[PDB]
Design a binder for these strands. Sequence first.
RNA 1: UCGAGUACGACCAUACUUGAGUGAAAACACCAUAUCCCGUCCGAUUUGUGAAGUUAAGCACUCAAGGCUCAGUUAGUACUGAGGUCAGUGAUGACUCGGGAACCCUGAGUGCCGUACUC
RNA 2: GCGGCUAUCUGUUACACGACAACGCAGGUGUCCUAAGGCGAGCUCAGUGGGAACAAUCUCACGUAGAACACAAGCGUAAAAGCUUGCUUGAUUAACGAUUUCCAGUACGAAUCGAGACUGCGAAAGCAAGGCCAGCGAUCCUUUGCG
RNA 3: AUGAUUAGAGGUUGGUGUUAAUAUCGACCUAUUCUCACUUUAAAUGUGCAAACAAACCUGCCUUAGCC
Lengths: 235, 65, 149, 161
Amino acid sequence: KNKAYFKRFQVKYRRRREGKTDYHARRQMVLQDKTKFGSPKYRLVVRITNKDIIAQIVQAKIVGDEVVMAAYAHELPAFGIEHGLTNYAAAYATGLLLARRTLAKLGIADKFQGAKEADGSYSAVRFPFKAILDVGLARTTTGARVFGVLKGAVDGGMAVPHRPNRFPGYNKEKSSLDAKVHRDRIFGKHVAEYLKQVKEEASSAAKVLPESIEGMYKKAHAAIRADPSKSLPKK
Amino acid sequence: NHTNHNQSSKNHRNGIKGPMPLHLHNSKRGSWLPALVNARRVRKHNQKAALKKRRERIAAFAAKN
Amino acid sequence: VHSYGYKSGTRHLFAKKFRKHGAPSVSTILTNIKVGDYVDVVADSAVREGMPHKYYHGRTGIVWNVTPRGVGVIINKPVRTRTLRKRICVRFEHVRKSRCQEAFKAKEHQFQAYLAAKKAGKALPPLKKSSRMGGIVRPKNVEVLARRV
Amino acid sequence: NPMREIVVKKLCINICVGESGDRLTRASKVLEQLCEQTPVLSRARLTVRTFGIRRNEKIAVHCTVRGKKAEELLEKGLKVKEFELKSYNFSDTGSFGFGIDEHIDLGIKYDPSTGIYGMDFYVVLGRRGERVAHRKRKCSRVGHSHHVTKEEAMKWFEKVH
RNA sequence: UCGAGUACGACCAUACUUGAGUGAAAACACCAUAUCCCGUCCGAUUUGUGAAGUUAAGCACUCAAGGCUCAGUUAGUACUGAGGUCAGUGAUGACUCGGGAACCCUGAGUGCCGUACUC
RNA sequence: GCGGCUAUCUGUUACACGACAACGCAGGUGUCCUAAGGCGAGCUCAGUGGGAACAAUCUCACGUAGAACACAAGCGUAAAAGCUUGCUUGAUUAACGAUUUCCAGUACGAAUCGAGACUGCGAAAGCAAGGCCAGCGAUCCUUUGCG
RNA sequence: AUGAUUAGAGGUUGGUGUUAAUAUCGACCUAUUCUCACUUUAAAUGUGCAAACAAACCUGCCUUAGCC
Ligand SMILES: [Mg+2]
Ligand SMILES: [Mg+2]
Ligand SMILES: [Mg+2]
Ligand SMILES: [Mg+2]
Ligand SMILES: [Mg+2]
Ligand SMILES: [Mg+2]
Ligand SMILES: [Mg+2]
Ligand SMILES: [Mg+2]
């Protein structure tokens, strides 16, 4: 400063100077061929935070990005265990919980069968409702909750395109339908190896049954396809 | 010896003719194919319609005359 | 005539303006163009891939072609004794949707809606009043003028 | 008071030996157990070359240690040098370190096949809240106006020592 | 439960950055941990996984300065299109018919709104 | 007349569209790169302000480009277009379709928007038909490919 | 501001004329300064466009290319 510097200093884009949005990724996602004249491009902008996660389907409008059908992991606990919030499977949980209510908002009942309920190694997408995935600045290390919500959505009637090259089951050749199906539902041996023997040493995720934690989600999956509204009890 | 003198007054003798309007040489050609390949097929139908619309005319204009 | 390249004598022309540099807008990426509307071909730098020749910078003209990411614009060019409708091919970021008709877009929108209101409509709400006429004006401060030095 | 306290971030003991070859042939190996994390190299751009190093040549045998394992290895930079060096080493931000020309001065052993190198346990203290000044997502300022300073340094310099 | 809270944004400094103040619910936030995918030479960064905790940073709210924005000047000034069988000097100078600044300084204030949720 | 430059590139000339001349000024070119191409990610440069056995580098500040970008110059770019790494050949065939600049609206040269494959890099949207824009060549003949 | 161009008021970095005390001119440090090419959507003059019977409507076709 001081002086003639903040005279010719250009302030950077308001989100960028302090915030999230990446205006070289922002401008490449919302961008669309000028032929398709105002054809709707819905994103799948998902944001993982520390305590919770945030996923909503957005189309950019000149008035400002117009969010439609937001779906969080603070509304699935009104139908789930609420013991794991940032769980990889909790990502998958809101993945279809977001994927469902859009089709219930789009009146789309035909493709509303979605995909198979069981975890799939991989599915190839196009006819169905389509969107593109926005991680933001969350990185793309193989396996991520921005990607459980991806596959959580795609397996739930979304046509969010993806390859398996970056799935937790993916390895140097292909995507392990065993190494994924666990994490997508539960891999509770992360508690039956340390947190089960927590009392077996000295003083110290209580109330948790590692014998039902896997099924504690398979209850929620098939319920979402029945109860999309599934709003947390208000008032 | 470059001069440019007398040239602006030469261009304005016989006038700087205005451009042709858009309905002149509006050949949507060399443009983007997936548009003109559709603006083609819709011209074929609209011609089968233009020919058909004249077929009833004359035949309506015959019996109803 | 030593240099006459495709980008000659254009330091200040393609240079970005002061304290406004960098990436193009998200409006300019979210614009919507048809075959036929008017566009201001304002070649901005910082994209440097699809800029038109210098000449076609303050120029506006019909969009005869909208490819996926290139707008085709016809532009009148007074060559010597005739104008050519040039057919330039630029990308979208070098393009504004040209206002140049809001002058009567917004005029006949309310001008007819009140001519209709004046012809048939429902009622005729009184409009802008007269401008230039006489008047017995009452002053509010007298003055004179001689000099100031 | 809970998060107002200082704790050394990292003690990245830096060796700056000359050009590579049989000069750095045992440096990294006897430095693979002082911290248990593999030592690093340093591709030089300046490389004054009066010591020998040229452009892109292994000269400075870098390392990096942090966390509790560095806090304990700090009890060696606080073992030799009478556990206190000159207070003229406190950085503008509150960094300080020790170091000796004797590598075997520690529980190390100056084995015959290796030259007599050493280490420089240049550590840098700092309170909790530095993981906000550098974040790949959702960055901010350094969190200015509450940090370690050349006065708060000499506080924890001899508090935890 | 009401204003705002996150995350998405559109204008892009009135929004910037400074010294602080301020944070009542939530909610971000740092935070715990290598028990897994993970890639960290590093649990820094991120990326598995949750809540002992904490407003210490962060962040929004307050004042209150460069800078920025709006205006008052600056100033009908400089400059300028046009016109003299204008005046001298080949220096622009005034005039007439018009256009008409800027830097500065005295100011004003120091963001605004738009979709979903949540209370 | 020697001397020097005709094909070209940037600034300037050049006068706020464009155009605009001078053995007019200042500089560059007839190349160089399997990466100095492509893409994705990570990172942020010149400088500085202080700090550490050795003593540069690891330290963190503040840093609107004061660097880098194969080169001349000018534009341009800061979660990059620069730096590091990764994986790669889109530097390919292009049904070439149109256009721009030079223009006579003729080539050429270089560019721009496309299409069809086949592709690479990306989780993806998208990005790539070289390295932006100087770096190049008719008839005939020779020559190879093409069936 | 990229640069200046620079001396006038005096005080980190070199050599040096001095008796740890002193300057000395450069670099610097400052409030400046002087008058220029580089700066700013900063003129006048310019120039690109558009401006009434399909440019708006109230409607209805057809292939639907786009998008579910
Ligand atoms: Mg170049
Ligand atoms: Mg250069
Ligand atoms: Mg590129
Ligand atoms: Mg040419
Ligand atoms: Mg050609
Ligand atoms: Mg070339
Ligand atoms: Mg490219
Ligand atoms: Mg005219």
